[model samples]
Target: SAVVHPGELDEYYGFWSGGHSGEVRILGIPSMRELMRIPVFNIDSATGWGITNESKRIKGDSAHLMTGDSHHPHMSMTDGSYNGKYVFINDKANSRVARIRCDVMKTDKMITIPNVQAIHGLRVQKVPYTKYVICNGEFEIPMNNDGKASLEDVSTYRSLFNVIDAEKMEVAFQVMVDGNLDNTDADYDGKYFFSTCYNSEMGMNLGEMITAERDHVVVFSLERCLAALKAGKFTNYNGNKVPVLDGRKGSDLTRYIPVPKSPHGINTAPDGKYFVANGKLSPTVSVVEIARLDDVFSGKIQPRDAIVAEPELGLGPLHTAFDNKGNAFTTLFLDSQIAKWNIQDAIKAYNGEKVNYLRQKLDVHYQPGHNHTSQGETRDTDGKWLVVLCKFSKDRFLPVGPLRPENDQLIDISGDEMKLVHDGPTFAEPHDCMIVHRSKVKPQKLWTRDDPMFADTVAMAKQDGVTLEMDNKVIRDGNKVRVYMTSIAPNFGMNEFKVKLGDEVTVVVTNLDQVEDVTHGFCMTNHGVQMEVAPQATASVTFIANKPGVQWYYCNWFCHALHMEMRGRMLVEAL
Candidate 1:
C-alpha cells in the first residue's frame, strides 16, 4: 500500500527540481508529502539564503541575478550507488550549477559556467566516485560571444559539454560540440558520458531546427578529454582559464551517433549494458550498447554500429526509466502515457526475431516530461515505485486560477501492472526528480559549530576578540560595526545596540540551544534584513543603518511561549 499512517516514516526520499523557482524540494515517497525546500538559486527570505554573507560568497558574481530555472537534480554516487553526501542541481536560466550538502540540507556552493548561454542536462559521475559533474550547454553561440560577432554567422555557433569538479565546484574543462545539447547521462564504468543533440542543423528558428530527419547523441570519452587537457591540446574561450576541447565529429575526444529526429533524454540502464536515447520528435527510442562503444572509439566500427536496437515506443518519447526486472518505462509526452517495454525483447525484435517488446501502456494525467523510478539511475534500483511529472494538470485538482500547479503522480510498479496511487499538486513547475531509499540518506539533527558553511564568520569573530556563543559585544572600526550575540530560547544576548546613521552594520546571531528543533531568527524591521540561526549554528547579515531612529528587531521564527517578547532594538543616532 502507498499510504503511511501518522507517526510512520516514508520508505524513500525524493528530491525534486523546482523549475523556475530556483529551489529543490524534498518529498516523502508513497505518502507523497513535502518534507522541506532547499533554496539553491532563489532568494529565500525565510532562511535568508541569498541575503546571508555565506551564501553570497558561494554565489559570487551571479548573486545579483536572484532567479534561476533549476532543471535537473542528481545526487552524488559511489560505485554507481547513492552515497547520499550531496545533491547537485543545474540552473538552466543562469547557466549555473549548485551543490547542496545532504547533512545540513543547505546549498554550500554555486558556480556559473562561462562561455555558455544556458545549462540544461546535468548528471554526476557514477562509478568509483562522483568526482565530476557533467552538464550540457543547451544554446549554441559564438566562441567568444563578445557581441562584436555577426549574428548571421551560423557556422561559428557551437555548444559545449561542461565538466566540473564535484568537490571544488570548479569547471574542470569544456568540450565543444556541434548542435544544441539537451539531456545527458554517465555510464557505470565512468569512462564515457552521453548527451542528446536536437539542433544538428544549428538553426536559429524552431522550424529550421527540426528540418533534419535525424539528430544525434554525442559520446564523450573522459580518458581522451583528460589526455587532451594534459597534453595542452585544448584552447581557452572568452578569456576563461578552463580548457575547451573540440568534441565535434572527427575529434578524438568524442564520437557522434546519429539518432532519430530531435533526441531529448539520454539515460543509461542500471545494468550498465545499454543507454536509451529518447526521440522527442520520432516515435522510437534508440538503444546503444555500452560494450560496443569501445569499437566505435577504436575505429573498429562505425558510430551507428554501437546502436543495438531502435524500438518504436510512442509519440514524443521524452525520458526513460528502468526497473530491476529488465523493464524500461518511457514517458510519451504527446501520447500522455508511460510505455513499459522489455529491453531484451526490444533488442530481439531489432534482430529480426518474431517477438513483441511492448508490455503495457499506462495513461497519465496529461503531458508527462520526466518519469523516474525508485533508485532508477543507480545500480541498486528497487523498482518499487514510479513518479511521473505531468506538465499539465487541467482537471486533476481543484481550480485555483489560470496558473495551475503541476501534477506529480505516484504509481505502484512493484507488481506487473503500474497502478496509480496518488496525485500530488506542486507549484509553478518541476522538471525532473530522483528517488532514493530512506536508509541511504543520513541528515543531521543539529548544526555543528565547525561546519564550513559559517566558518568564515567564525574566523571574523575570533579576530575581533568576540566569542560568538558566550559574548554579547559590538566592535566598531571607523564607520563599520559588527554586532555579535547569542540566542537562547526567547532571549537575545544583546537587547539594545546603538550606531550612527550611515554606519555599515553587520549583525551576527548564534543559536546556543543544545536541544533539537530549536531554531532562531533575526529580523531588523524596515532595514530589509532577516536570517535564520539553527541550533548551535551562526548566521550573519550586513546592511546599512541609514534610518536615524529606533528600529525594532525581533525573532521571526517561533521558539518558545514568550516568542512574542523576543524583540530587540537598534538605535541609530543622526550623523
Candidate 2:
C-alpha cells in the first residue's frame, strides 16, 4: 500500500517539470521520488492548443492557460481557518491539474482546462462567496472545446487569464489581455484581484527557440471582466465572441515597464496593500497598487495606482514570498541559495539612508536542489521558517559557478572575513520554504516556530561554523547507487584532500577553522572522465582504481580569490 506521507504533499499535487525534461515527484518531508514521466493526462481535442516550456509545470506552461501544457501550476486550497485545502501542480507533458489532497497524500479530484493552450500560474480565491481560479494562456482562446483543435498555432500563448469556478468546476470566464506571454500573475484578497501582464516574446524573436529580452506587467479588473461579458466584449478573437487582441497577428497588452528576461511568479502581500510581480529569468520585481475591494467586486469604476514588484537582485530570480513585517524573501533559482531584503529598508536605502552601509550585510543564501535545479519556498505562519522544495533530477551539466566575471563572489568569502554558525538539522535543495501554519497541516510543535538561536528565522537562515558536510557516497549493487549527506569534512581547506586512483584509501576531511555557512563541494577528473563528487555539500565518493593515468580533483565551490589556489590532483593506477 502507498503510505500517505506528509512531506510528499507536493508530489501528490500533480507533476513537477521545473527541471529539464521533467518528472513527477511526491511532495513531503524528506521528499520521496515516485515516478519519472512525461506528465500528460486529460486530453480534449476540442479546444485550441499550445506548447511552451515555462520552466516548471505551473498553470499549464507559464502562459498557456489551457490544460495539459504548463510547467509548474500551483493549486489554492483552504478550509475555515483560511488555510490551503487541496493544492495541485502540473507536468508540462499533459497539462492537467491533479487536486493535491496533501493531507491524505492523494489526488482527490483532477480536472483539465478547456481551451486556449498551455496553462501556468493558478490561484484559488473566493469572490462573492464563490471560489475561482485564474490561469495564463500561451495564446488567447476560449473554455469551450468543440470538435477538432489546431496544432499550427502555438502563438496562441497569449495574455488570457482563465477563471474557473471550482465549486461548479467549470470555466466561468477568461480575462484576455493582449501580448501576455509568461508574465501573468494575480492577487485576490478574496475580494478584488490584481495580475501583471507582459508580452510573450518580450519583443525579441531570437529564432530556433523564441525567448524574451524585455518583459512587462498588465492589470486586470475582474469586475470589468463581468461588464465586458454583459456587453459581449468577451468573445473568441476571430470568432468575435470572446476577449482577444489580434485576429492573427499577436497584440501588445500593457505599457508595462520593459523588464529584462522572462518574468514570472507574481505574489500578493499579506497586508493586502500591494501586489508583487517577479521575473524568473530576470531578477526584477514590480510593485503594483491594489484597487479598492468594493470597486473591484462591483466593477463600478476603473481601479488604478497599479504597482509592479520589481527589485534588482542581479540575476534570474524565480519566486518571492513576503513576511508579515513587509520584507520580501526572494530566491535566485539558478544562483545556489536564498536571500532576504528589507524592501522596506531597501526603499529607505534607495532614498539615501545611512542604512546603505548595511547593504553589505543584507544577503542570505541557500543551496539549490544540486544541479540543473528548480525549487520554490514559502514562509511559515509565525513569519519564521519556510518550507522549501528541492526538485532533484533537473541536474543539468551546465557547469556550477564561480564563473569568470559573472560569478566572482562565490569563493571570495574568506575565513578571516566570515564567522562560523550552526549545522542544520535538515535540508536538501530546499527551493522555496514556508511555515505550514497550524490549520493547514498537522505537525510537531517544534516544526512551526522560529529557531531558538535567532528571533527571526529568516535572519538566521542556515548553518554556520567551520565546514559542513554533504554525503553523496555510493556502494553500487549492480547498476543502482545511493547518495547521502554526511558530517565528515573537518576544519580543513579544499586543497587538503589528496587521493589517487592507484591507492586504497580510507579518507577523512576536516573543517579547518573556517566559516561554516560557506558551502563547498569537490569533484575529480581522471582517465578522460570528469565526475563530480558533490557540489556545495560535505560529501565524498570512492571507487575501485580501474582506470589508468593521473587524476585531477578540486573544490567545486568557489574557494578563493583565485580558483587555481583550490586545485589538486593525483595519479591513478590500474588495479
Candidate 3:
C-alpha cells in the first residue's frame, strides 16, 4: 500500500514518535511510504544501538544504556521560525533529549541531566530577545541514583523544567514547578510556555482523580527564566545550580492559572491571540485569551479568572490543531473521533455574545492521541492535510503474533468535510508527530570521504590521526589489541588479525566510500559486535576474545554484490 514511483522528490515528510520503540520514523505523506527509522536512547538491531560501545557517544552519559519512551517530535526554529535544519525528541523514560540534524537525517548529539528524569514535553521557544527549548519534568527519581525517593515528601523530590540552548544543544538552566508536569506548549510570540499539572502532590504511582488537584496550568516566563540564569538563582545537578522559580508563591514570571480537570494539551492559536486547553476528564475545550496575557499576570487584569470554556465538543477532548481558515480540530480519545469548531465564533462568544462553536465531527480508526498540521505550532499554520495517530489497529493487517501496529489515518482537510484518504500501519506505536514540506528541508544525499564536517576522521577522535592510505595494523599492547582498517566494497585493509586467547580486541572500521548512499556495516560472528558506518564515517567495537581459533567478520548492510567477498578472518593463537 505504500508504493511510490521512483525519482519522486515532491513528497511531504512526516516525523512520528515511535512510542515504546524509543525511536523516530520518517514517512512520506500521501504515499504513506516509510523512509527510515532512527534509533535514539534504545537498542535497535538495525542500527546496532547498544551492541557496540559507541552507544553512549552522542549523549555523553551511561544513562543511554537504558531505553527511551519517545513522545513529542519537534523541529528546531531560527528567529522564531521553523528553519527545518534540526529536529528534537524527548525521552520520557530516561529523561534525555536528542537532536537530529536535517542535513544528515541522523542524530548527531544528545544531552542528559544528572538529576532530572522523565522529560514529558520538549518545545522550541523563540522570544523577541532569545530562542531556546524547554523540557518539562514528568517523573522524578533520586538524584544520587541510589533508588526511588519517597513520594510523600514533596520537598525531597523536585518538579522542574530544563531550559536548553537550541544552538549549543545543552541544558542552560533549570526551573522548578509546583506540581507534576504534563504536556507543555509555547505561545505564538514564544515569550511564555505552559505545562498542564496532572497532580498537586508528588508520590509514586498515585491514583489520578483521588489524590490529584482538579484545576492548574503553569505559565512559564522565559524572561523570568533568563533573569534567574543571569542572577544565578539555583541548585546544581551536574552544572551550576539555578533556582527553579516558585510557582506556588505566585511569582510574576512563574505563575499558576486554574483551569478545569486533568488537561493534556495546552496549545496556543496561530494568530497569537488565544490558547486552548483540552482536558481528558471533560468534553469541553478551555479557550484562554492571550491578547492581555502580560496584563493578566501583572495585576492589570484578573489573573485567577482568565479562562473561557467551550462545552460539548466531544466525550473526551485531548489535543487540538489549527487550520489556516480560523477553525480548530480536536481529537476525542474516548469518543474515537475528531470534532471541528470555529475559533472566530468562540472568540466572539467569549466577548459575551451567544454563539455556537462546534461545527462537525468524524470518526477515526480508533482512539487517537496527538494530531499534527503543517506549521501548526507557529503563527503561520498550514492545513492542507491532517495526520491522526491512533492507539490501536485491530485486524487491519496480517497477523504478526499478538502485538499489532499503530494506525495512522491521513485525512484531507481542503474541503468542508474531512475525508479519510489512507490508512498507515506503523510497526511501532506513534504518540506524536511533526511534518515538513519536501521542498523546504533538503537532506544531504551522502557525505563525501573528504567532508570536513562529517568525515570519519573529523567526527571521531580515535580515528582522527589514522588515514585510509595506511595498512591495517594489529598493534598489541599487553592485554589490548587495536586494529585500525579502511573498509571499502571488496576488501578491508587487512585480511586477518593475529591475536592470543583472552585478549581484548578493539576494531575500528573507517568507510572510504566517496559516493552518496554507499554506506557499510560490520559485525563479528562470535563477538556479537556490530556497527553501522556511513559514507566517510568511522565506527568501532570492542570485545574480549575468550574463545580460540578462526572468527569471521563481514558486511552487515548485505548489498553491492561483492558483500560476500567482504569477509575477513581473525586468527586466534593460544596464550
Candidate 4:
C-alpha cells in the first residue's frame, strides 16, 4: 500500500558524509530486525555511530555533538539519468537522519544538520511534476533528552521545514518557524492532504530554558502552503492564518476518538475509506472517519467513540491493522512490543466477537540480537501477516552508557515469554514492521454524538480548554535578521511562523510573558533559512517565496513534554 514515488528505495547506491567530504554507505532491512541500519559504511577508510570519526579529535559518538562550517552532504547520482537518482546525507553528529530506502543499493544517507544542533524524526516526500525529493528538518539543540525545562524557561528552536531537490542534491526551499510541524501523516485526498501538528520547545539562542507545550493535532489545507510560496516577498504566511480543524472534543475527530501523546505514523487506511493515527506517548489510536473529515472544519459529522485499548502497558499501544478475518492488531512503542484485538474491540464499549490480545508471548527480536527495544510498524501488501520491525535499542535511552549490561541484550518471549526463533548475520535492527492483509474493510455502524457520557466529556474538556490570544510587533525588516524565540507555549498553544520571501515582510509572534519556554523553528526547505528569536522577539526576513501552497511548519525541538503541542497554520495568498 506504501509506494516510494520518486522511485523504489532499494537497490540504489548509498550516500553518506565521510573522507572529510560526503561519504557513501550501504543500508539493510534485515529479517530479524525491523530497523533500517547503516551496515557500518566502512568507506574502505576512516569514516565517522554509525561511522567513526577517529583520531581527528572528533567526538562522533558524543551524545551532544554538532560540527559543520559550510554546506554539508553533497554527492552525485548513480543511474546517470539523475531521474531515479542519488542523494547526499550530512552527518550532523548525533542529529543524523538514517536514510531508509527500497532500492537495492540499500543506501544510508547520514544527514548532519548544517546549523542546528540536533535532528530527529524525518519523512521523505516526492515533489510533484519533477524528479526531486524534499526533506523536512527538526532540531533539538544537542541537549540531554532526559533534561527538563518549562515551555517558558527552556531552550527553544524553530520549526524548520526543508525541501531538497534530488536532481541537484541541493535544498530547494528551506523554511524556519517558531514552533512545531509533525508530518507523520500527510495523505493526498485528491483535492488536498490533511496532516496533524505537534509542537515543543528548545533552549538555544532563545533566552533561558522553559517548559515545553506541544500536544495538539491541527488539520490543515495543503493549498495554503502552495499559495504561500507563490506569493512574493512582502507577503509572509503563518499557518494559524488559515481555519484549521482541531482534533478536540467537539472538533473534527468527534465521530471516532482523540488519543494522547502527539500522534505519530499516520496513513490512509488500506481501504482508503478511513484515516488512522497513533499516539506514541499514549495507549490509544485516533481512528478518524474520513467520510466525516469532508465537513470536519465546517462541522458536519461529530466523533463519539474512543477505542481505549489495554492501558496497563507503557506510553504507546501502537499501530492499527485489520486482519483478513476483520481483526485488529496494535503494537506498543514504549515497551517495544505489540497486541492483537478483534476489530470490534476498537471501541471502549464494543460487544461483538471476543478475542484476547497477544501481550506476553509474541517473540520479537532486537537488532544486534541484544535486549534493545523494538519500535514502529506498518502493514505489508498481503494484509495477512505483520512483518514486524526488529530494531536496535537506542543507546540514548540506556541508563548508563558504559556500565549498563542488563537491558543491552536480547530477551525471548515466544513460548511463555518471547522465545528466540533464530539468529542471523548481516541483519540486526528493526524499528517498524510491514504487513499484508486480505479482504476489504466494510463500513460498520455509525453512531450519534447525543450520548450523555460522550457529550459530558466534550463539554467538560471544553470548559477547561485554554484560550490563547497573542500578538507582536515587527522588530526589524531586513534581507535576513535572526530573532531568538524565548517561549513556546502559554500552556494552551504554540507558534510556527516564518518570513522568507523576496521583499521585506513585517512579521510578529507574540505570547512571551504568559507562555512557557523552549519552543523553536529551523526549516531549511530552501537551505540557508534561519529563524531564531528571543522571548517574544519579533523578527523578519526577505527570502523568495516563489512557490505557493501549505508547507511543513513545526516546533523543531525535542522537549517531549510539550513537543507535540506547539504548532500553527500559515496561508500565503497569490499575487
Tell me how candidate 1 scores on lDDT: 0.93
Top-TM-score structure, candidate number:
1
**lDDT of model 1 at position 230:** 94
**Candidate achieving higher lDDT, 2 or 4:** 2
The models' CA-based lDDT, in order, is 0.93, 0.39, 0.74, 0.34
Candidates ranked, most accurate by lDDT first: 1, 3, 2, 4
- Root-mean-square deviation of candidate 2: 18.8
Put the candidates in TM-score order, highest first. 1, 3, 2, 4
* Pairs with steric clashes in candidate 1: none
**Higher-ranked by lDDT: 1 or 2:** 1
Per-candidate TM equals 0.99, 0.49, 0.92, 0.42
26: Cα error in model 1, Å: 0.6
**In candidate 2, how many Å is residue 461 off?**
57
Best by lDDT: 1
lDDT of 1 at 375: 95
> Taking the tens digit of each residue's C-alpha lDDT, what string does model 4 give over 1-575?
21233534422222222312223323221223222222222221211122221111122233233332111222222221122223334333343433322222223233333433433233233213222333333443312232356234344334444444444434444344334444333232422233333443333443322233224333433344444445531122232121112222332221223335555544444333444555655655555554555465455543233222323333454445444333444456555555444333443333333444333424343321111111111122223223333344334243444432211222232123334333322221222222111111111122222322123322422343411123222233365322223344423132443444442332222224323334344332432333432233222223344444443444444434665555443333344
Worst 10 residues of 2 by lDDT: 46-55
lDDT of 1 by residue, 434-527 (tens): 9999999999999989999999999999999988879899999999999998999899998899999999999999999999988899999998
Looking at candidate 3, what is the lDDT of residue 318? 88
